[PDB]
């Protein structure tokens, strides 16, 4: 089906075989280089108005842990930034690596973080999420890096639910959670246009990658990387990494919202 993964056999180098978008010219993630980035004084701040009550479920689909929100109407919204209008929060998920010294998808001046949080939104202008996938700005993602430090209390609440989704196919209720609670102090961001870092890798994403990383504990990162990609009874298989290697920037330009 959508069969894919991050192993050498089913991994990123092979995704284009079944998912031809993977080989596109506007793929993500990318390496950011500050020598190649300027402050764009025209970039506006962004804001969110999330309803914690819009949270619905948490699930393990075999290649990440995802929280899903009610996006049947304009409930939890993201606005401003380089966006043409308000976008609906649909879900958030994470990428991680096998140890703390890597795991992020994007990198900044060569630096890699322990993980990357992606909050996925879409533009109601396009009617549905599925149709939004066919527009270069259909989806808007808030990318947040995760760095090692002190335990994050807000992140802990999320981690406390992982026990319910240890294996692939597991899905459990997850309500009353405002993921804005995870955001760092600064709303400073970089932006550029790219794709999903997972198949089918549609080129429909406006990236709002935050300058400041959220901090979590090494211990929390261990919990995050304790999930399995196998189902309740099978041969336990660890899901220890799910980050995609950097793709060609081509002629795209990343912009900074901050001086």
Q: Are 92 and 67 in contact (CB under 8 A)?
A: yes
> What SS3 class is residue 59?
strand
**Long-range pairs for 196-200: beta carbons < 8 A, 24 or more residues apart:** 196/28, 196/139, 197/28, 197/29, 197/95, 197/105, 197/243, 197/244, 198/4, 198/63, 198/244, 199/2, 199/4, 199/15, 199/18, 199/19, 199/21, 199/22, 200/2, 200/19, 200/21, 200/22
Beta-ladder partners of 142 = 119, 208
Is residue 168 at the binding interface for Zn ion, with CB under 5 A as the rule?
A: no
Nearer to Zn ion, 118 or 225 (CB): 118
Q: Does 63 bind Zn ion (CB under 5 A)?
A: no
Query: Which of 24/53 has CB closer to Zn ion?
Result: 24
Interaction of residue 90 with Zn ion, rule CB under 5 A: no
Report in angstroms how near the CB of residue 118 gets to Zn ion at its nearest: 4
Where does this chain touch Zn ion (CB under 5 A) — which range of 106-114, 118-126, 163-171, 218-226? 118-126
Mapped onto helix, strand or coil, the DSSP state of residue 219 is helix
Residues tagged in the binding site annotation for substrate: 197-198
Q: Which is nearer to Zn ion, 43 or 139 (CB)?
A: 139
In angstroms, give the least distance from the CB of 149 to Zn ion: 22
Q: Please indicate whether residue 118 is annotated as part of the active site.
A: yes
Catalytic member of 106, 107, 116, 118: 118
Q: Are 146 and 116 in contact (CB under 8 A)?
A: yes
Residue closer to Zn ion, measured from CB, 53 or 64: 64
In the bound state, the residue with its beta carbon closest to Zn ion is 118
Considering only CA atoms, which of 253, 239, 186 is closest in space to residue 213?
A: 186
Contact call for residue 244 and Zn ion (CB under 5 A): no
User: Which tokens hold the place of 161?
Assistant: 């639910």
Whether 63 is catalytic is: yes
93 belongs to the catalytic site: yes
Residue 118 binds Zn ion (CB under 5 A): yes
Which of 107, 167, 191, 197 is catalytic? The answer is 197
- Contacts with Zn ion, residue ranges (CB under 5 A): 118
Catalytic residue numbers, as ranges: 63, 93, 95, 105, 118, 197
């Amino acid at each position: 089906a959508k069969e894919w993964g991050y192993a050498s056999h089913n991994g990123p180098d092979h995704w284009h075989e079944l998912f031809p978008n993977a080989k596109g010219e506007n793929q993500s993630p990318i390496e950011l280089h500050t020598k190649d980035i300027r402050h764009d004084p025209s970039l506006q701040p962004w804001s969110v108005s999330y309803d914690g009550g819009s949270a619905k479920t948490i699930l393990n689909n075999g290649h990440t842990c995802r929280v899903v929100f009610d996006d049947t109407y304009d409930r939890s919204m993201l606005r401003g930034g380089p966006l043409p209008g308000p976008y609906r929060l649909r879900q958030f998920h994470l990428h991680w690596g096998s140890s703390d010294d890597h795991g992020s998808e994007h990198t900044v001046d060569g630096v890699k973080y322990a993980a990357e949080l992606h909050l996925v939104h879409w533009n109601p202008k396009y009617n549905t999420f599925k149709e939004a996938l066919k527009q270069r700005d259909g989806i808007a993602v808030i990318g947040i890096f995760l760095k090692i430090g002190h335990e994050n209390g807000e992140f802990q609440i999320f981690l406390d639910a992982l026990d319910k989704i240890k294996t692939k196919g597991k899905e459990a209720p997850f309500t009353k959670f405002d993921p804005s609670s995870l955001f760092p102090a600064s709303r400073d961001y970089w932006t550029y246009q790219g794709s999903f870092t997972t198949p089918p890798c549609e080129e429909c994403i406006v990236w709002l990658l935050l300058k400041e990383p959220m901090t979590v504990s090494s211990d929390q990162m261990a919990k995050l990387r304790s999930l399995l990609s196998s189902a309740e009874n099978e041969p336990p298989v660890p899901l220890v990494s799910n980050w995609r290697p950097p793709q060609p920037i081509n002629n795209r330009v990343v912009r900074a919202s901050f001086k």
